[PDB]
Amino acid sequence: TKNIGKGLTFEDILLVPNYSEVLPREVSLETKLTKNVSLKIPLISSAMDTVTEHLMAVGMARLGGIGIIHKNMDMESQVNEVLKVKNSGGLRVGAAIGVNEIERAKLLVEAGVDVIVLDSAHGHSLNIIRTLKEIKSKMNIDVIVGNVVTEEATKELIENGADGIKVGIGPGSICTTRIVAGVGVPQITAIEKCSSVASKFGIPIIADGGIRYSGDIGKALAVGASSVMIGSILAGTEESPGEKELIGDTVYKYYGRVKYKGEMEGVVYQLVGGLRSCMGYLGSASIEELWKKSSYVEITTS
Amino acid sequence: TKNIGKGLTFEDILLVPNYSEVLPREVSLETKLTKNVSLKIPLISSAMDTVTEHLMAVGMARLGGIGIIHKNMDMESQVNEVLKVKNSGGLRVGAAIGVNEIERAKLLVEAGVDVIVLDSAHGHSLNIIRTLKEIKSKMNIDVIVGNVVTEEATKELIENGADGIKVGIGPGSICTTRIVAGVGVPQITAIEKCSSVASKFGIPIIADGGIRYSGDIGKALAVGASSVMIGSILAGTEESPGEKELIGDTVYKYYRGMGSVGAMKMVPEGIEGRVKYKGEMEGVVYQLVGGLRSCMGYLGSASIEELWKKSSYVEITT
Amino acid sequence: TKNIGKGLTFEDILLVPNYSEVLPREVSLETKLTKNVSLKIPLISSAMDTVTEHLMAVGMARLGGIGIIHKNMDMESQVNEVLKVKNSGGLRVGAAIGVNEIERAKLLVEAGVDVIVLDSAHGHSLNIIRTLKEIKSKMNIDVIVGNVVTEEATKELIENGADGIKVGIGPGSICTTRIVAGVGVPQITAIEKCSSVASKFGIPIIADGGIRYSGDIGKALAVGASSVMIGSILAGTEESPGEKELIGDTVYKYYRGIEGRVKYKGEMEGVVYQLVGGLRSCMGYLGSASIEELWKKSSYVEITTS
Amino acid sequence: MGTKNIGKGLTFEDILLVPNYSEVLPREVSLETKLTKNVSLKIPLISSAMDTVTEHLMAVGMARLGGIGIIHKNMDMESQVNEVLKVKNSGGLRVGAAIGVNEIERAKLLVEAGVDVIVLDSAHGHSLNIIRTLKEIKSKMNIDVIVGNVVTEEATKELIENGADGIKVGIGPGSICTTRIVAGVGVPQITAIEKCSSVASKFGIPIIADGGIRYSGDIGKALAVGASSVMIGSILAGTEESPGEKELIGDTVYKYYRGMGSVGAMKSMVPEGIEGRVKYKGEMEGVVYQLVGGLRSCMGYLGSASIEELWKKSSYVEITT
Ligand SMILES: O=C(Cn1c(-c2nccs2)nc2ccccc21)Nc1ccc(Br)cc1
Ligand SMILES: O=C(Cn1c(-c2nccs2)nc2ccccc21)Nc1ccc(Br)cc1
Ligand SMILES: O=c1[nH]cnc2c1ncn2[C@@H]1O[C@H](COP(=O)(O)O)[C@@H](O)[C@H]1O
Ligand SMILES: O=c1[nH]cnc2c1ncn2[C@@H]1O[C@H](COP(=O)(O)O)[C@@H](O)[C@H]1O
Ligand SMILES: O=c1[nH]cnc2c1ncn2[C@@H]1O[C@H](COP(=O)(O)O)[C@@H](O)[C@H]1O
Ligand SMILES: O=c1[nH]cnc2c1ncn2[C@@H]1O[C@H](COP(=O)(O)O)[C@@H](O)[C@H]1O
């Protein structure tokens, strides 16, 4: 049968409470971004022109996470954005590249970047793998490759030198892939499939897209991810790369338009709190402890 | 797999009628709150600062149920509220306590409380059990423990001296636990799993949160619960705490979760808002009780014990 | 657990087309209302304060169906309503009674009523069964008994003398039993359950409530029912009880303890024509020349929420 | 729990295509497909046989882009012939024509006009009248015959045996369709294509997925699951090449769109179609390129260089609403 089964998304499930000995404040949110880079919190700001530039990356790094500077600009600009983050405190920083963009990656590495995010709409392709091999042979850096949803995809990327795999075809807030192409796999299932491969190799999984609430972070992690990438939640915050605008009562941020969210610190604080509480309910002091102990129930939309 | 099954809530379910010889009026609503405390009607008012204080507890007790005084006040104030209910006839009351609140527990027991509700967002925890053991070893008192959703939780609480188990993580109009933490089990499935353990030991199940209509009470009880704890339905009534406010045409009263920003003044796990004034709570409780009697008429059950014996339900689509 | 399965409503299913030799215009719609009262179309108007009196029962009867006069009136008044129909061309007519209403039934049978409809919210009662038995012992008439949703309930009523079984607890457009009592069985599942008993004894099933479109009639009949009782579909019509009024260039009349207002639906014939037409089309798709063929040939697919 | 329940029916919105390893860019994808046993197309798109989507201008544009148009039968015989001939005058272009039950005179004239496919169109294709018409045509005329509409294995098997060169699937879908409401009849489209393809692929008879296409993604879903081509009406209604009149209401330009079994369409049985205005979609060529791009993107995700590759490699997941 062509039907491989029932795909489950964030809103379809709820995590089941376990016996607990840990207070939410006692929980350790420390995780691995790649096999050689680690973070204090499992949050990553998306590589979109509407979410992560130098300001956003500085904020994320100071709060224990990491920003990925988007590639939608010239090489010199992206290297500059990376330098600005490194200048103010010597923080953790990442940057995205497309296919065949070897020189871009090279200059980003020399700028001091900690991770290169090899992004594409369909990560399980020839050209993505060729770029991966080419990067690994020409420069010394940890590479995150995406996006994928299947077992074979995850296996082939790890074998070709991937230091982390990014999961997500479909869930993005500004979606078109599900409608234009009719292609995708729901996030919970997508993480589950990819985790069964990656954890045998000890390779971290980044859950990318579809996060609406702090609860979704807990589900994505509990299901097998090591970190979570967020876009829309951070889009519209003061630190996002836009300018403020006024329409009636409400303040907006143009580039494209989304509602102003205020300081990012308040937004990140709530996400962290929600995750701490989640891991409290499930009696897990660490994310690795969460993987071993977590379970969920299917829920009707209602 | 991590998928343990499909969870069902109140709205996903409909009770199947049985052969009936009992009119709604003939129905006995007698039930057990704890191992040693009994109720005339299986209704409890939630331990919340917008639902239950002394007026609510008197109203509940006179109608055959029980009010449980919230813990969002000082010990001296909570004792006084218990003493004010005991001031008018032989009325039964409960009182809520948090983790490691042994002094509050001692004072309420000595204030002549009938039950103590050891209340937690996550009832299956080390802190709860140790607080349970303390009170059970040192005080003569029935203790309801919550909140839980698993069979492992209920068994462990019962073995450590729980006289009643309160079930509910996720349901409740003001609850946002499942949004902010992604945690919960739908209420019917929750009761079902917990009831399978609790009935073996003869320990009553309190179904807490998620009741929107009188038909939900019947569903909770039919599936294995002994009583139902309600908050939102009694929130707007005259007997609930907080003053009344008229905005426009209709009068409003404030309803607030305990894990809400206002109530805490920990990540917020409850919403806050105004709800319409609902008149006297006895008019409200009458409707709920009537619906339960009607429900048990359909299933042909003269008692809740009988209800448990001949209950069945169907799943429904959206 | 206590989960007896998944309950399907009209909106949950679609009928699968079969090989067809019959055009919609050629199919027969003749059915049995009771054990020994038959209709030319499988439509019945609800016994409600707001849908069926003498005018409605006449219109229904002249179209091949039948009207059940509601009980919410004097025995004298209800007998008179039956009288106005019978003398309007020997038309078939039914009348509703409640529990213990033996005398009302007696006078209605004398008035020459064709069917008595023993109405209860819960037909599987001691009081319903003894009312049925007391009617049969004292008078000679076909009795439809309802409402029920289970196979055990259907059997007991048939054993006690029920000539028709009315099915429907929960699905009625104006019903709140699902909300007040939390009780019910979705209409398709309910008809399926009761048919597995009643078809063996040759006792017709009346599908009652939930019919919102003509396509629902087909589903109800296809799944085992002999006829459908329809309420809100016929509520705003000219022939229904109530007066016309204008509220902002729109004509209205009431539908039901107050229970909201409905728009004027015009002449009842046009409404019935569409319903009958839709059912003919359905039976074309399923290649069924008769309702008996429909039962033998029917299959349906479950449909997702979207 | 049955007993007349045969399973859960899946529609376009119920499933998602699972990506595979890809070596193919969207630009390098072959969209060439089989229309009937003997006729083939360069893009797998057909314009519906409706009096509000396809006449000569629509058919010309469709063929000019690698697809085909089916001239609707809601006109007299000589009018339909003239439409077929008007397509023939603007280059050696392929064109189809719709036909109703027992309309043999119509079929002979349409074949004379140089029609490439006869579409024996019916609401219920699995009937005794349709099979009789199929047998009469295939014995009396040299022409490829697409027969619809059907949803079952038995239906498609019987039509193939009686000389159907193509099977058209779809009872239930269609933006303007109310068969589900009026009759309570239908099968969700994914399930319908699956059931019919399982038979038709054994005989190499192309399946036409008819109705229910709202987005370019649906085309991929229909093809991936077993269809050879996709018939569309809704998304072509209101284009510059559609036979309707252009009309300004407020700030937006509108054109009319109606089902063939609607009240207005039957004027010039009970209605099984709704009618309404649709926003002017502009040039048709532009609308098709978006569909083709999304289709290419889809096959790029599944790493399929041709539709034959797509059938062999495609798989999907069920999703909740
Ligand atoms: O305690 C809380 C939140 N919370 C609540 C509730 N939240 C849900 C239901 S009642 N009521 C409160 C009153 C005062 C301050 C916080 C409060 N969350 C939490 C506790 C342990 C664990 Br493990 C995980 C999470
Ligand atoms: O023929 C019709 C209605 N109808 C339709 C369609 N309705 C649905 C899909 S195409 N297109 C028409 C064009 C002209 C006049 C009526 C038309 N229904 C029907 C026919 C046989 C059988 Br068995 C069952 C039902
Ligand atoms: O336009 C798009 N097309 C496809 N994927 C996108 C697009 N925009 C954002 N995404 C993905 O969605 C993620 C952000 O998801 P969000 O947090 O739901 O907004 C990004 O990291 C991208 O991987
Ligand atoms: O703020 C909170 N967050 C989550 N649950 C709460 C909160 N406050 C009260 N509850 C629970 O929700 C129940 C009330 O539910 P309701 O009657 O359906 O509105 C109470 O009995 C509490 O157990
Ligand atoms: O007040 C009510 N409660 C429950 N059922 C009702 C009530 N009123 C009418 N009904 C039933 O519902 C049917 C009408 O449903 P409708 O066709 O969906 O409008 C009638 O035939 C009655 O048997
Ligand atoms: O009036 C009708 N009732 C039901 N289906 C129709 C009617 N008219 C056209 N159709 C079908 O609907 C298809 C168009 O589907 P659409 O592109 O989704 O709007 C056509 O190819 C016809 O097969």
**Which 3-state string (H, E, C) describes D209-220?**
EECCCCCHHHHH
Q: How far apart are CA C141 and CA C118, in angstroms?
A: 12
Q: How far apart are CA A42 and CA A223, in angstroms?
A: 14
Question: What subunits touch chain C, counting only 3 or more CB pairs under 8 A?
Answer: B, D
C172 Cβ below 6 A of ligand 5: yes
B237 Cβ below 6 A of ligand 4: no
Gaps in chain C (C to N distance exceeding 2.5 A) after: 256
Instruction: State how far the alpha carbon of B271 is from the alpha carbons of A87, B235, B255, B260, B263, in Å.
Output: 42, 14, 9, 6, 10
CB neighbours of residue D28 within 10 Å: 11
Q: Closest residue of C to D189, CA-based?
A: C303
Q: Resolution in A for the shown PDB structure?
A: 2.8
CB B178 within 8 A of CB A212: no
* B contacts of A8 (beta carbons < 8 Å): 3
Q: To which residue do tokens 């020997």 refer?
A: C90
Q: List the structure tokens of B154.
A: 């209920």
Q: Which residues contact B214 (CB under 8 A, 6 or more apart)?
A: B287, B288, B289, B290, B291, B292, B295, C179, C180, C181, C182
CB contact under 8 A, D184 and C282: yes
From B51, B269, B271, mutation site for ligand 1 pocket: most ligand atoms within 8 A of C-beta: B269
CB A220 within 8 A of CB A15: no
For residue A5, the cross-strand partners are: D317
Q: How far apart are CA A255 and CA A243, in angstroms?
A: 7
CA-based nearest residue to D292, from D202, D219, D196, D205? D219
Asked whether residue B199 is marked as a ligand-binding residue, the answer is no
For residue C263, the cross-strand partners are: C252
D175 Cβ below 6 A of ligand 6: yes
CB contact under 8 A, B19 and C153: yes
Alpha helices in chain C (DSSP H): 54-62, 75-86, 102-110, 126-138, 151-159, 177-180, 187-201, 214-222, 268-285, 291-297
- Fill in the amino acid letter for B53: E
- Fill in the amino acid letter for A269: Y
- Strands D40-41, D33-34: pairing is antiparallel
- Candidates C130, C183, C192: best to mutate against B (most CBs of B within 10 A) is C183
Question: Phi and psi of C298, rounded to 5°?
Answer: -75, 140
CB neighbours of residue D103 within 10 Å: 18
C282 included as an active-site residue: no
Alpha helices in C160-247 (DSSP H): 177-180, 187-201, 214-222
CB contact under 8 A, C19 and D158: yes
Does the CA dihedral A10-A14-A16-A17 come out positive or negative? positive
CB D287 within 8 A of CB D279: no
- Fill in the amino acid letter for C18: N
- Ligand nearest to the CA of residue C281, numbered in listed order: 2
- Strands A296-299, B3-7: pairing is parallel
What kind and span of H or E run contains D88? Answer: helix D77-89
Q: How far apart are CA D163 and CA C157, in angstroms?
A: 54
SS (H, E, C) chain A: CCEEEECCCHHHEEECCCCECCCCCCCCCCEECCCCCEECCCEEECCCCCCCCHHHHHHHHHCCCEEEECCCCCHHHHHHHHHHHHHCCCCCCEEEECCCCHHHHHHHHHCCCCEEEECCCCCCEHHHHHHHHHHHHHCCCEEEEEEECCHHHHHHHHHCCCCEEEECCCCCCCCCHHHHHCECCCHHHHHHHHHHHHHHHCCCEEEECCCCCHHHHHHHHHHCCCEEEECCCCCCECCCCCEEEEECCEEEEECCEEECCECHHHHHHHHHHHHHHHHHHCCCCCHHHHHHHCCEEEECCC
Residues written for chain C: 306
B60: Cα separation from own chain's centroid: 12
CB contact under 8 A, B183 and A300: no
Instruction: State how far the alpha carbon of C38 is from the alpha carbons of B100, C113, C279, in Å.
Output: 75, 14, 18
| Ligand 4 centroid, distance to B48 Cα (angstroms) | 8
Burial class (CB in 10 A: 0-12, 13-18, 19+), B149: buried
Give the three-class secondary structure for D86. Answer: helix
* Topology (CATH level 3) of domain A1-302: TIM Barrel (3.20.20)
Gaps in chain D (C to N distance exceeding 2.5 A) after: 268
| Ligand 4 centroid, distance to B145 Cα (angstroms) | 15
DSSP C291: H
D70 Cβ below 6 A of ligand 6: no
Q: Which residues contact A151 (CB under 8 A, 6 or more apart)?
A: A193, A194, A196, A197
CB C109 within 8 A of CB C78: no
Question: What is the Cβ-side half-sphere exposure of residue C91, based on CA atoms within 13 angstroms?
Answer: 26
| Ligand 3 centroid, distance to A236 Cα (angstroms) | 15
Q: How far apart are CA C239 and CA C59, in angstroms?
A: 7
D82: Cα separation from own chain's centroid: 22
* Topology (CATH level 3) of domain D1-321: TIM Barrel (3.20.20)
D295 Cβ below 6 A of ligand 6: no
Residues written for chain A: 302
Q: How far apart are CA D103 and CA D117, in angstroms?
A: 15
Asked whether residue A199 is marked as a ligand-binding residue, the answer is no
CB B277 within 8 A of CB B252: yes
For residue A3, the cross-strand partners are: D316
Q: How far apart are CA C7 and CA C5, in angstroms?
A: 6
Name the CATH code of domain B1-318 (choices 3.30.230.30, 3.40.50.10860, 3.40.50.2300, 3.20.20.70).
3.20.20.70
Asked whether residue B168 is marked as a ligand-binding residue, the answer is yes
Taking the CA of residue B130 and the nearest CA in chain A, the distance in Å comes to 11
C144-177: buried (b, 16+ CB within 10 Å) or exposed (e) per residue?
A: bbbbbbbeebbbbbbeebbbbbbbbbbbbbbbeb
* D contacts of A4 (beta carbons < 8 Å): 18, 315-317
- Strands C300-303, D5-9: pairing is parallel
Nearest CA owner, ligand 4 atom 5: B175
- Fill in the amino acid letter for B6: K
- Ligand nearest to the CA of residue C213, numbered in listed order: 5
DSSP B275: E
D280-289: buried (b, 16+ CB within 10 Å) or exposed (e) per residue?
A: bbeebeebbe
| Ligand 4 centroid, distance to B257 Cα (angstroms) | 6
Q: How far apart are CA A76 and CA A82, in angstroms?
A: 10
Q: List the structure tokens of C124.
A: 């599987």
CB contact under 8 A, A150 and D20: yes
Q: How far apart are CA D7 and CA D318, in angstroms?
A: 14
CA-based nearest residue to B83, from B49, B57, B45? B57
Architecture of the domain defined by C1-306: Alpha-Beta Barrel (3.20)
Q: List the structure tokens of D309.
A: 């590759």
Q: How far apart are CA D271 and CA C281, in angstroms?
A: 10
Q: How far apart are CA C223 and CA C300, in angstroms?
A: 9
Question: Phi and psi of D149, rounded to 5°?
Answer: -105, 145
Burial class (CB in 10 A: 0-12, 13-18, 19+), B205: buried
Nearest CA owner, ligand 2 atom 18: D123
Nearest CA owner, ligand 2 atom 2: D123
CB B314 within 8 A of CB C7: yes
* D contacts of C295 (beta carbons < 8 Å): none
Q: How far apart are CA D92 and CA D88, in angstroms?
A: 6
The angle that helices A151-159 and A126-138 make with each other, rounded to 10 degrees, is 30
Nearest CA owner, ligand 3 atom 12: A172
DSSP string covering D199-212, please? HHHHHTPPEEEES-
* B contacts of A217 (beta carbons < 8 Å): 182
D144 Cβ below 6 A of ligand 6: no
CB C210 within 8 A of CB C172: yes
Instruction: State how far the alpha carbon of D156 is from the alpha carbons of D91, D124, D134, D200, in Å.
Output: 34, 12, 13, 7
CB contact under 8 A, D317 and A186: yes
Q: How far apart are CA B39 and CA A144, in angstroms?
A: 62
Q: Closest residue of C to D159, CA-based?
A: C19
Burial class (CB in 10 A: 0-12, 13-18, 19+), D314: buried
- Fill in the amino acid letter for A86: K
Q: How far apart are CA C20 and CA C112, in angstroms?
A: 42
DSSP B260: S
Q: List the structure tokens of A5.
A: 């089964």
CB contact under 8 A, A122 and D217: no
CA-based nearest residue to B293, from B38, B66, B28? B28
CA-based nearest residue to A78, from A97, A91, A64, A61? A97
CA-based nearest residue to C108, from C88, C152, C138, C146? C138
- Ligand nearest to the CA of residue A229, numbered in listed order: 3
Q: How far apart are the first and last CA of chain A?
A: 30
Q: How far apart are CA A224 and CA A238, in angstroms?
A: 32
Alpha helices in chain B (DSSP H): 54-62, 75-85, 102-110, 126-138, 151-159, 177-180, 187-198, 214-222, 232-235, 261-264, 281-298, 304-310
Give the three-class secondary structure for B127. Answer: helix
CA-based nearest residue to C40, from C49, C29, C51, C48? C29
Instruction: State how far the alpha carbon of B241 is from the alpha carbons of B108, B237, D190, D280, in Å.
Output: 20, 9, 56, 60
D233 Cβ below 6 A of ligand 6: yes
Q: How far apart are CA C203 and CA C142, in angstroms?
A: 11
Q: List the structure tokens of A86.
A: 């490194």
CB contact under 8 A, B15 and C156: no
Q: List the structure tokens of C261.
A: 């207002």
CB neighbours of residue A236 within 10 Å: 23
Residues written for chain B: 318
C/D interface, count of CB pairs below 8 Å: 132
Spot the catalytic one: A14, A174, A175, A181: A175
D222-243: buried (b, 16+ CB within 10 Å) or exposed (e) per residue?
A: bbbbbbbbbbbbbbbbbbbbbb
* A contacts of D297 (beta carbons < 8 Å): 180-181, 183
CA-based nearest residue to A59, from A251, A262, A253? A262
Question: What subunits touch chain B, counting only 3 or more CB pairs under 8 A?
Answer: A, C
For residue D145, the cross-strand partners are: D118
